[PDB]
Amino acid sequence: KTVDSRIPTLIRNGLQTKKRSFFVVVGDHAKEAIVHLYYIMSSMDVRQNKSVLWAYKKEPFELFISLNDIRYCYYKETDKILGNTYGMCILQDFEAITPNILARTIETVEGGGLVVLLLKGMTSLKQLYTMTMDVHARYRTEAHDDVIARFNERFLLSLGSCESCLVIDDELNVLPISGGKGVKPLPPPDEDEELSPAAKELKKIKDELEDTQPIGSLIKLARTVDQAKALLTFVDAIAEKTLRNTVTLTAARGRGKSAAMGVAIAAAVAYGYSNIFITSPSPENLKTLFEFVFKGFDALDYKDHADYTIIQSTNPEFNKAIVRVNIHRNHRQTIQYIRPQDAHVLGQAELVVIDEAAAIPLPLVKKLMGPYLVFMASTISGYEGTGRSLSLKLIKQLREQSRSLKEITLSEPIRYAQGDNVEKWLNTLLCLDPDPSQCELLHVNRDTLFSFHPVSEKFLQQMVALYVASHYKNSPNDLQLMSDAPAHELFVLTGPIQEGRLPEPLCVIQVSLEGKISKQSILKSLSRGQQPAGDLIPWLVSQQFQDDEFASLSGARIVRIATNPDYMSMGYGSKALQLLVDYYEGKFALPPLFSKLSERRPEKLDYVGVSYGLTQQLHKFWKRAQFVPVYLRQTANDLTGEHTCVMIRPLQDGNDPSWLGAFAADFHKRFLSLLSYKFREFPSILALTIEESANAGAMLDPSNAPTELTKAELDQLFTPFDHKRLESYANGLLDYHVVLDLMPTIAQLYFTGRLREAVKLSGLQQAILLALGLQRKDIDTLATELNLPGSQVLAIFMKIMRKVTQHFGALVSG
Amino acid sequence: KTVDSRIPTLIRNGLQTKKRSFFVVVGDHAKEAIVHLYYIMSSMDVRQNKSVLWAYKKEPFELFISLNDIRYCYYKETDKILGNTYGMCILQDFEAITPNILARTIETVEGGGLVVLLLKGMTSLKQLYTMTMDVHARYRTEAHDDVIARFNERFLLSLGSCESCLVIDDELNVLPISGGKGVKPLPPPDEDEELSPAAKELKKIKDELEDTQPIGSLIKLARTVDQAKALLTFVDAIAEKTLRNTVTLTAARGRGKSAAMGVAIAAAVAYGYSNIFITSPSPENLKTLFEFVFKGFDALDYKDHADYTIIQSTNPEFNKAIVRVNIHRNHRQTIQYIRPQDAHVLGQAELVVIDEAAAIPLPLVKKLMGPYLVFMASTISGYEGTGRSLSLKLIKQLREQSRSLKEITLSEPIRYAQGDNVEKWLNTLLCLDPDPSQCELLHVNRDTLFSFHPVSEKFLQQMVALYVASHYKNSPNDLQLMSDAPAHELFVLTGPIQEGRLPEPLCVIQVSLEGKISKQSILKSLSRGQQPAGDLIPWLVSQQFQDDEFASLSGARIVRIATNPDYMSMGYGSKALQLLVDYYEGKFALPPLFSKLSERRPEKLDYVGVSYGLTQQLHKFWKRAQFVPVYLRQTANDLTGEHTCVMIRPLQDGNDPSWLGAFAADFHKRFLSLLSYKFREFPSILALTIEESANAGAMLDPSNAPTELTKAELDQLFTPFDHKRLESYANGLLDYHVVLDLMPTIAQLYFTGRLREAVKLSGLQQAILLALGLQRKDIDTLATELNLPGSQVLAIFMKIMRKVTQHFGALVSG
Ligand SMILES: CC(C)(COP(=O)(O)OP(=O)(O)OC[C@H]1O[C@@H](n2cnc3c(N)ncnc32)[C@@H](O)[C@@H]1OP(=O)(O)O)[C@@H](O)C(=O)NCCC(=O)NCCSCC(=O)Nc1ccn([C@@H]2O[C@H](CO)[C@H](O)[C@@H]2O)c(=O)n1
Ligand SMILES: CC(C)(COP(=O)(O)OP(=O)(O)OC[C@H]1O[C@@H](n2cnc3c(N)ncnc32)[C@@H](O)[C@@H]1OP(=O)(O)O)[C@@H](O)C(=O)NCCC(=O)NCCSCC(=O)Nc1ccn([C@@H]2O[C@H](CO)[C@H](O)[C@@H]2O)c(=O)n1
Ligand SMILES: Nc1ncnc2c1ncn2[C@@H]1O[C@H](COP(=O)(O)OP(=O)(O)O)[C@@H](O)[C@H]1O
Ligand SMILES: Nc1ncnc2c1ncn2[C@@H]1O[C@H](COP(=O)(O)OP(=O)(O)O)[C@@H](O)[C@H]1O
Ligand SMILES: [Mg+2]
Ligand SMILES: [Mg+2]
């Protein structure tokens, strides 16, 4: 009955220092352990006894659940507990706790609380090393069905590296694996006269401005010194009543940026501001901002339903998303929430607050800048953070624009004390925090990369920090995908290195093997709507082209490829791609972490393919490596604003590249017609490059060569009066509005190869002809895009039409 | 040397009563007459000696011009003197004074002034009856070259009907033609104690609110009692601080609506309003509104460059047009000018002022209404007024919408006393102020219609009041065009009437004869860019179709046709049109004003044509009368927002209607391709009706009948994989985004007649197919236009594609 003395000792130390505690329970009676832990935690303190959070998948204790406020949440509903604070968190089903769930469920516990994780009944702790998960179902494919678990090995291996983690059994017995069995009791403090220096500084900052309003009443809301300084900077910018200011605030997750900006909004309202606009990537990012706006209003003695009213958008799915707040104390004032694409409504703005400015595409932010006062906040680390390259681009653009720019930072968290052990363990576990010709490609073994060896861990952090430097929002589920995928392989590009020194990864490539689908399943899928969706390239070309022979081949999909942000644009990605291609072409004739390519026999593959969001810079890189386009989605992505593009390369050695020419020619014929449906927005050059690349890739089939245009076929397209109209226009005797129904036919004649060899056009003429004929654009829209006067775009368009007319006349007369 | 006593008597009476005087000078030394008149006018009064305005075309007096402020203006620059006030106006060149110039140059003279008109040296006053004008050059054509002047006859005949008009010679001698030779001197008044009742009422209204602010200081700006009441209503609406009000103000031209609204804007600014928006058809309508806004600011003790700043749009042509005003007294306030199509920026508005609301198309006004406070002003009579039908529609819609609506009116002018004689004469001269089967068409003689006989004048006013009832802005130049055109004819539709009673005009038709152009001139024009532009239908079809045989025919153009607004939609316009057509088909086997059709032999004409702005209601009326479309402009009209459409009917009796089938078929082939260029905006039904009408009119040529589609031609359009994709979509195994490049081909196949007889489609299916295939519209845009859910529009579109697929399969297999 005597409880081990280390449990209350650790709980008391956490309560004294205001830091969390981690407990892992193994057995079939975890209810008693949780009850005992809660009793021990509650019997020591009274200021920290908040609600208890419980998270699960689908499914004394009886008295315990009937005495405390328990919020029950599903693993899929964890987005609803955002912004709360709990005194205890419980996770029940170990089988389905993805890293995304784990990051969210733990950050909502204040200092001094308990984090309890429940494990199913076991006899030995080694059965988790390969236990099946609820996510492995999506991993399995027809070709590959055996999946080896590696995340759960690292999860138990990392428990011994935490100094605040205790692992106990049903009978409350400490286990050797626990990394906090050496904790000694802390000396009892005396705070009767002793006070922390930070507390004294905070009290002094609050007191020196008590006699001033409204800042004196508002400053009583801050909890950290950095929060107080950020509020001081915001209020100093606001009260200056000059709209030539900009403040950018960057910090980790949980430092207090949203609350600070919310209180600054109330200060701005109290200072006489009328037009206030708030933008964010998602309306779920403003939940605490709009709470602290109302907290500031309450601290300013405003009354509800008499001084302000709240307008809430009930109709869409986000019912709780506030959209508008009206204030009628002295004169009418409003606070409006808009989308980042609605920059045309900011003509009369006075204050625009951009929450999560790093996760917004840069041109949208560039268009949201005006001649007024701007507040920006961004996340640089922690869960859902932004890659360093995007942040560097954002701050570089802001510095280029400058108007006064002031940058501030926050360090100390709010819910728990700085230097918390559980936060450090979580950041570690999820990784949340030479001449090119001389480089060499290597294969990284995944059995030892996830073995928690110090060298392997040091390399894994470097690779993950490499491949997430361009994400808009860091996601820790890709770590589990990389670890537990059955067919994924990792390749790293290193320079010349010596023995005993780990090479620094210049580039990293992740590849997946796809293909080899039985024709019975392809026929079943092509005759119905169901699709396993295990693969991406086999299952898309078959549906788009209604073909049954492509999905039976073998190929590789490049899931991810990323180089060092400091080493970009110097030739390493191309070298790594070429080396991988040569490896798969048979050009090279505790296991060690690094294996040379010459020591392993490659696979026999027919093609290699990639899927990415279309951009000119990325398309040029992929086209230089001999990739040809096959697909281009019509609906743009909401998170970025780009269309998915698929490219395939026929890398097979000594085989006929004819099955790909048909696909390329079909795509080329579809793109010309589809330029009017949702591809009207594309810049002319971007569509021109895709058309040129598809036409060049369609030449892999010699039967796809174009044929000339004869007089007999021409007479079936243009009547003699059409010829007369074209001739009159070419001589300058007609307006260009008259000969405008003939543009699609001439464009289709030129861009399909019939007229290509007869008349030659430059790049600018090709772009103008493509736009006018296939995208149906106006002359004034063309003038803006090309940065040329409108009266000059027509001058070069009359030269396209007086070269075609001569050929038509020679063909008809001859 | 002794001046006639009637001149100073009339001048003194005008000065006493505050009314203008009209003088006409004939001779070669009008300088001395003008000098004497100015001296006589100035020697009596001192409070009215303002600047002298001089208007001319191209080209003691020496001392006279060097002592007074004279503003010299050109006849083409009369738009620059808008809003001013002068004490004397002079018109020099009688040869080019169009009615539009005459209306503008006279309204800017305050009461008590002089209006002097100069006439060239003459021996008899009868030479003006047929004197050539500077406008007659545009009237002459190749076919008709003799023009008879009639406006100058009426101008001299109406001078004798004015009681304030004197006609004098070089030696200052009164002429019998003068209509004010019987004026007797007025008794000398005594205003030492006597005051006008209106002046007493105005003083009382000003005084009873002196102690209140800011209305007490602002009310000192009004000049009439009606202006004061309008300002009181505006300020009462503003100070209520409830945004559920609307005030509509209607009056003649010169009553004080713009100034009243300008002062109300200053009151709103002083009452704490932040967002204020001003819209108008043209930025030249706000010249006095923005002047009185600044006058109110000055009366409110605001200081320039310290309390407000003015932002002016220098870059466009309208440099003087103010676009934005910023106020920073207590908190930032602004006043913005927007275009009527910019209703999307009014999300945060508090006061929207719509000047000249009748001249704006009704849907724009309907979209400018919001949940805020609206001020409207409109012109109902006088120069540049709006027809009564448009105003009735506007007020009926406003009453339907209602929110509180309050309507006010102004009667008494500002610059001159009410009951002015010159204003009455100007309004008179320029006309600024049964079963259908039993009706009969008549021809109106223009030699007696403009002879100033009382009966002829009474009928002319009734006709002009008929044909201007739908104009957005009344223009008095059309009166001169109707009077002096060499080939124009007027027809009126009257019911059964008795002798001695003038019939009431139910409908009026104006026709012009066009055609008969020598082929030499047509060849010269078609081989260059120059065009006489005398005709409209011959000179447009020849250029659009590059044809040389149409312009040599003979035809009639219906310039105007309008019925009684109270008798609309009851069958009179159709009856008049049919009777005119039968008259021109040879179906009928001081001169009197009315001539029966049976008494005159018609002309031999091949076609009849009309040009109008496209609308569904007008297109249906014209199509019912067997008219076929030939042209449709691509650029919309700025004043209305509609595209010009041309329709022609082959009315010739017993001739081949084959020259028109070619034009109709060419237009039908151009419209299908041009639906993507600027006709994407058209509603589906409106384009469908035009396509159906053009296809039906193209059948006048039997060689234009369509042919069936054969398997050989089908195999040259769709590959077997395209057939497989279409079949898969028809069975519900594909997304509609996949088979979307095939839509233009199917639409062109169906709407050109190849597939029309094989597969039958209803009206809704035809509209959806036309939109999706030829206009490239989205599904969500289609759902809004058709007032149907988006998920139901697709359900009926999958029925179009499973009828075409079966025919294609039968054609291929068979
Ligand atoms: C290209 C690169 C790897 C090596 O390039 P290098 O450094 O090695 O440059 P190199 O010397 O070889 O040649 C010089 C030439 O490269 C060009 N170039 C030069 N600098 C840049 C630059 N900074 N950026 C771009 N191109 C550049 C060119 O400008 C220059 O032309 P030029 O000189 O010859 O003038 C390296 O740039 C890089 O990190 N690129 C970005 C990271 C990445 O992974 N790229 C490969 C992507 S595919 C797998 C993949 O992930 N697909 C996706 C993507 C999104 N999504 C969804 O979208 C959402 C998120 O978005 C959502 O989350 C979801 O994810 C998805 O589902 N699947
Ligand atoms: C149609 C009408 C005469 C006789 O029609 P009826 O009274 O007779 O009606 P009816 O019994 O015969 O048959 C019933 C059928 O008529 C229809 N219908 C019934 N009510 C209405 C209605 N209220 N309006 C419309 N259609 C209606 C239908 O709805 C119904 O179909 P439904 O039942 O069988 O259901 C008589 O409506 C009317 O005033 N329409 C307007 C005045 C006018 O002149 N119209 C002829 C125009 S061409 C010459 C001309 O001027 N061209 C231009 C025009 C503009 N511009 C430039 O644009 C600027 C200005 O905009 C710029 O200033 C410049 O001017 C230009 O340069 N040259
Ligand atoms: N001044 C404050 N007073 C009380 N609670 C606060 C204060 N500032 C932050 N918090 C709490 O701490 C959390 C901070 O999260 P937040 O600062 O919104 O994240 P981010 O760093 O992304 O802005 C909030 O959930 C809020 O409940
Ligand atoms: N209260 C006033 N004080 C002085 N002048 C005025 C006043 N109201 C109007 N006016 C003069 O009379 C003219 C009235 O024209 P306006 O009222 O703008 O025409 P509308 O009737 O179309 O609004 C203006 O040119 C202005 O100079
Ligand atoms: Mg935030
Ligand atoms: Mg006006």
CSV table of C-alpha atoms in Angstrom, one decimal, chain A residues 31-180:
chain,number,residue,atom,x,y,z
A,31,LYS,CA,-8.1,3.8,-13.5
A,32,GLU,CA,-6.8,3.3,-10.0
A,33,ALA,CA,-3.4,4.7,-11.0
A,34,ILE,CA,-5.0,7.8,-12.6
A,35,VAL,CA,-7.2,8.3,-9.5
A,36,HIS,CA,-4.2,8.0,-7.2
A,37,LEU,CA,-2.1,10.4,-9.3
A,38,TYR,CA,-4.9,13.0,-9.4
A,39,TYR,CA,-5.4,12.8,-5.6
A,40,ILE,CA,-1.7,13.2,-4.9
A,41,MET,CA,-1.5,16.2,-7.3
A,42,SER,CA,-4.6,17.9,-5.9
A,43,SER,CA,-3.8,17.4,-2.2
A,44,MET,CA,-0.8,19.7,-2.5
A,45,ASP,CA,-2.1,22.8,-4.3
A,46,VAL,CA,-5.3,24.7,-4.6
A,47,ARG,CA,-4.5,27.4,-7.3
A,48,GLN,CA,-4.0,24.6,-9.9
A,49,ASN,CA,-7.0,22.3,-10.0
A,50,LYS,CA,-8.4,23.0,-13.4
A,51,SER,CA,-10.5,20.8,-15.7
A,52,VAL,CA,-9.3,17.3,-16.8
A,53,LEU,CA,-9.1,16.6,-20.5
A,54,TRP,CA,-9.8,13.1,-21.9
A,55,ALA,CA,-9.0,12.1,-25.5
A,56,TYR,CA,-9.8,8.7,-27.1
A,57,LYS,CA,-10.7,7.1,-30.4
A,58,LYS,CA,-14.0,5.4,-30.1
A,59,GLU,CA,-14.5,3.9,-26.6
A,60,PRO,CA,-13.3,5.3,-6.9
A,61,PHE,CA,-13.2,6.0,-10.6
A,62,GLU,CA,-17.0,6.1,-10.6
A,63,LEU,CA,-16.9,8.8,-7.9
A,64,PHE,CA,-13.9,10.4,-9.5
A,65,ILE,CA,-15.7,11.1,-12.8
A,66,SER,CA,-18.7,12.6,-10.9
A,67,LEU,CA,-16.8,15.3,-9.0
A,68,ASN,CA,-14.5,17.1,-11.5
A,69,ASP,CA,-15.1,18.9,-14.8
A,70,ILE,CA,-14.1,16.4,-17.5
A,71,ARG,CA,-14.2,17.4,-21.2
A,72,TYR,CA,-14.4,14.3,-23.5
A,73,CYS,CA,-12.9,14.8,-27.0
A,74,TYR,CA,-12.4,12.5,-30.0
A,75,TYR,CA,-9.1,12.1,-31.8
A,76,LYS,CA,-10.7,13.7,-34.9
A,77,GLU,CA,-12.3,16.5,-32.8
A,78,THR,CA,-9.0,17.8,-31.3
A,79,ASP,CA,-9.4,21.0,-33.3
A,80,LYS,CA,-12.2,22.0,-30.9
A,81,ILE,CA,-10.0,22.2,-27.8
A,82,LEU,CA,-7.7,24.8,-29.3
A,83,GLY,CA,-6.9,27.6,-27.0
A,84,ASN,CA,-8.0,26.0,-23.8
A,85,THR,CA,-6.0,25.2,-20.6
A,86,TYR,CA,-6.4,22.0,-18.6
A,87,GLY,CA,-4.8,20.7,-15.4
A,88,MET,CA,-4.6,17.1,-16.6
A,89,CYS,CA,-4.6,15.3,-19.9
A,90,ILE,CA,-5.3,11.6,-20.6
A,91,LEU,CA,-4.7,9.6,-23.8
A,92,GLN,CA,-6.4,6.2,-23.8
A,93,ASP,CA,-6.0,4.5,-27.2
A,94,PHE,CA,-2.3,4.1,-28.0
A,95,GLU,CA,-3.1,2.4,-31.3
A,96,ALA,CA,-4.1,5.6,-33.2
A,97,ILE,CA,-2.3,8.5,-31.6
A,98,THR,CA,-0.6,10.1,-34.6
A,99,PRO,CA,2.0,12.8,-34.0
A,100,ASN,CA,-0.4,15.5,-35.0
A,101,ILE,CA,-2.8,14.4,-32.2
A,102,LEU,CA,0.1,14.1,-29.7
A,103,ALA,CA,1.4,17.6,-30.3
A,104,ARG,CA,-2.1,19.2,-29.8
A,105,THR,CA,-3.2,17.2,-26.8
A,106,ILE,CA,-0.2,18.0,-24.6
A,107,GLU,CA,0.3,21.8,-25.2
A,108,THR,CA,-2.9,22.6,-23.4
A,109,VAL,CA,-1.7,21.6,-20.0
A,110,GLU,CA,-0.5,24.3,-17.6
A,111,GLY,CA,2.6,24.1,-15.5
A,112,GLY,CA,2.3,21.8,-12.5
A,113,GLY,CA,-0.1,19.4,-14.2
A,114,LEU,CA,0.2,15.7,-15.2
A,115,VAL,CA,0.4,14.1,-18.6
A,116,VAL,CA,-0.8,10.5,-18.4
A,117,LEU,CA,-0.5,8.0,-21.3
A,118,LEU,CA,-2.3,4.6,-21.1
A,119,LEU,CA,-0.9,1.4,-22.4
A,120,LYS,CA,-2.7,-1.8,-23.1
A,121,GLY,CA,-2.2,-4.9,-20.9
A,122,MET,CA,1.2,-6.5,-21.6
A,123,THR,CA,3.6,-9.1,-20.2
A,124,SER,CA,6.8,-7.6,-21.9
A,125,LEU,CA,7.4,-4.1,-23.2
A,126,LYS,CA,8.9,-5.4,-26.5
A,127,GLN,CA,5.6,-6.1,-28.2
A,128,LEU,CA,5.2,-2.5,-29.3
A,129,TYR,CA,8.2,-2.8,-31.5
A,130,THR,CA,6.1,-4.2,-34.3
A,131,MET,CA,2.5,-3.9,-33.1
A,132,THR,CA,0.0,-3.0,-35.8
A,133,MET,CA,-1.5,0.5,-35.9
A,134,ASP,CA,-4.7,2.0,-37.1
A,135,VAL,CA,-2.8,4.0,-39.7
A,136,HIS,CA,-0.9,1.1,-41.3
A,137,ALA,CA,-4.1,0.2,-43.3
A,138,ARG,CA,-3.6,3.1,-45.7
A,139,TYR,CA,0.1,2.2,-46.1
A,140,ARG,CA,-0.5,-1.3,-47.5
A,141,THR,CA,-0.7,-1.7,-51.3
A,142,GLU,CA,-1.3,-4.6,-53.7
A,143,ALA,CA,2.4,-5.0,-54.5
A,144,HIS,CA,3.7,-4.4,-51.0
A,145,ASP,CA,1.7,-5.8,-48.0
A,146,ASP,CA,4.3,-6.3,-45.2
A,147,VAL,CA,4.9,-3.2,-43.0
A,148,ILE,CA,7.5,-3.0,-40.2
A,149,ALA,CA,6.8,-0.7,-37.3
A,150,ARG,CA,9.6,1.7,-36.3
A,151,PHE,CA,8.0,4.8,-34.7
A,152,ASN,CA,6.9,2.8,-31.6
A,153,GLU,CA,10.5,1.7,-31.1
A,154,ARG,CA,11.8,5.3,-31.0
A,155,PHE,CA,8.8,6.3,-28.8
A,156,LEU,CA,9.9,3.8,-26.1
A,157,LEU,CA,13.6,4.5,-26.6
A,158,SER,CA,13.1,8.2,-26.1
A,159,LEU,CA,11.2,7.8,-22.8
A,160,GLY,CA,14.6,7.3,-21.0
A,161,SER,CA,15.9,10.6,-22.1
A,162,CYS,CA,13.3,12.7,-20.2
A,163,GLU,CA,14.1,13.7,-16.6
A,164,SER,CA,10.4,14.2,-15.7
A,165,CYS,CA,9.0,10.9,-17.0
A,166,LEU,CA,8.1,8.0,-14.8
A,167,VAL,CA,6.9,4.6,-16.1
A,168,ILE,CA,4.7,2.7,-13.6
A,169,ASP,CA,2.8,-0.6,-13.6
A,170,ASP,CA,-0.6,-1.6,-12.2
A,171,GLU,CA,0.9,-2.1,-8.7
A,172,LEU,CA,2.7,1.3,-8.9
A,173,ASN,CA,6.2,0.0,-9.5
A,174,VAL,CA,8.9,2.0,-11.3
A,175,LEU,CA,10.6,0.5,-14.3
A,176,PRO,CA,14.2,0.7,-15.5
A,177,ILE,CA,13.2,2.2,-18.8
A,178,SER,CA,11.9,5.3,-16.9
A,179,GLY,CA,14.3,8.2,-17.3
A,180,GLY,CA,13.4,10.0,-14.1
